[PDB]
Every structure is written in C-alpha cells, then in structure tokens.
Curated annotation (Swiss-Prot):
Its main location: cytoplasm. This is 3-deoxy-manno-octulosonate cytidylyltransferase. Pfam families: CTP_transf_3 (PF02348). Keywords: Cytoplasm, Lipopolysaccharide biosynthesis, Nucleotidyltransferase, Transferase. It is an enzyme of class 2 (transferase). One of its GO terms (cellular component) is cytosol. The keyword Nucleotidyltransferase applies. Transmembrane segments: none annotated. It comes from Haemophilus influenzae (strain ATCC 51907 / DSM 11121 / KW20 / Rd).
C-alpha cells in the first residue's frame, strides 16, 4: 500500500485560489483527490496552509494536514506532513500536485510500485521529448538514466548532446531529434523516512545553479529510479485558459 499527499497550491499569480476553482461542480482539488483514490492509495492527504481550502477538503471527506506558512520548499512541506501525522519511516509516499485534475491514476500507482520494486528511497517518471523547441527549453527538465532506470543526471541543459547535429547548429527548431530524450515529470514516490533525510542535507551549489532541488539527492549519492510514464500526464492548471480546457474535457467525457 501507499499514501498520497496533495499540496493544495492555493498561491498562484495568474490563477489565485485555483484549488477551489469549480470544474463541473467540484473544486479542482477534489478532482485530484478523487484521482488519487483511483490509483489504489490506502490514504490520501491534502496539505495546505489555507483555512478555506482545509474546510472545503474536509467537506468532501478528505484528511487534511495544515502546513506552516514559512518560506521552506515543497519537499520541506512534505516532511512536515510526515512528522505531524507520525508517518512510519518505511511508508511509501507519492507527491501529486493539487492543480492536476486530469492526472492519470495509473502513473500515480506506477511510481509507487516502482519504489517498492527497485527498493530505492526515491522514484519518479519521465516522458519522451519529440520537439526540438521543447528540448532546448530550460523549463523542460531533461533526465537520463542507466540501463536499469537509475538516474545519471537531471538538467535544464540539453542532454545527451548530439555531436553530429549540434556542432554548428544554426536553427534548432529544424533539427531532427533521435529517440533518446526524456522530459522529467514532477511526480515522486519516497519512503517517508527519506524525506526527512532529504531536507536535512545541506543546500548544494549544484541545485542552486540548475534550480533543481532533486540534484541534492544525486549530489549526496542517493539512487533515484526513473521510468517512462505509462501515460503522458496533462500540464497542471495555472491559467484561466488551462482551466477552460479542463472544463471542456470533463464536459465532453460525460454525455
């Protein structure tokens, strides 16, 4: 079995209070909660520092853990939940974002099973990158693993470098990419006890440069397993446009 923790994500610049945005009669956060239940999770916790969100979540039967209103990171907020609920060290925890109402339950279960299968302290997923435009986008995190799926490195820089095609490239948007690129997806599985260790490790020059918190784990020599996601998850909702899109999709799926 495993536990899912869903960060509410109330704070948003272009879509403030999005966790409570209505999507076909239910707040977006409730959709994520229901997808979590459909993944086979034995426990689903909504974590938030917002009283209004907590009240709404409890109203649809969700266990809620209030997180402190500090500066600390997301991983830092996951640790606080583990500590406050006294979650045993070996419990498998899957972190899913509160603004992904269309997250495929199958991939939530996938990362959880992978954590147990390979017995690592941290597991994640990736999806193929097909466009050069996305490949060179620093916002798309590229990842590479060894033959067993154990991560070599994560980076905003393009890896692997294609010698023959990248040498004196003049138009990246027109380069034909090989089938070797992977975009890391921000869905994780951890052993509850490891999160505590993760946050205890000192900040690294590496993570500060790439602005990738997960590099702290690689820097400290901890094995991470990454596998191709069984299904490509939709981008999280953060704009009114994205919200309209999800509403249209859920509207189409019921008639």
């Amino acid at each position: 079995s495993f536990t899912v923790i869903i960060p509410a994500r109330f704070a948003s610049s272009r879509l403030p209070g999005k966790p409570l945005a209505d999507i076909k009669g239910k707040p977006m956060i409730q959709h994520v909660f229901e997808k979590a239940l459909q993944s086979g999770a034995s426990r689903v916790i909504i974590a938030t520092d917002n009283e209004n969100v907590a009240d709404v979540a409890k109203s649809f039967g969700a266990e809620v853990c209030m997180t402190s209103v500090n500066h600390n990171s997301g991983t830092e907020r996951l640790a606080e939940v583990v500590e406050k609920l006294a979650i045993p060290d070996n419990e498998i925890i899957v972190n899913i974002q509160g603004d992904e109402p269309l997250i495929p339950p199958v991939i939530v279960r996938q990362v959880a099973d992978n954590l147990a299968k390979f017995n690592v302290n941290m597991a994640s997923l990736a999806v193929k990158i097909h466009d050069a435009e996305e490949l060179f986008n620093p916002n798309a995190v590229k990842v590479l693993t060894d033959k067993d799926g154990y991560v070599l490195y994560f980076s905003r820089s393009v890896i692997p470098y294609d010698r023959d095609q990248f040498m004196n490239l003049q138009d990246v948007q027109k380069v034909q990419l090989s089938d070797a690129y992977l975009r890391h997806i921000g869905i994780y599985a951890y052993r509850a006890g490891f999160i505590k260790q993760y946050v205890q490790w000192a900040p690294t020059q590496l993570e500060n440069l790439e602005k990738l918190e997960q590099l702290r784990v690689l820097y400290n020599g901890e094995r991470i397993h990454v596998e191709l996601a069984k299904e490509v998850p939709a981008v999280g909702v953060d704009t009114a446009e994205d919200l309209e899109k999800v509403r249209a999709i859920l509207a189409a799926n019921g008639s």
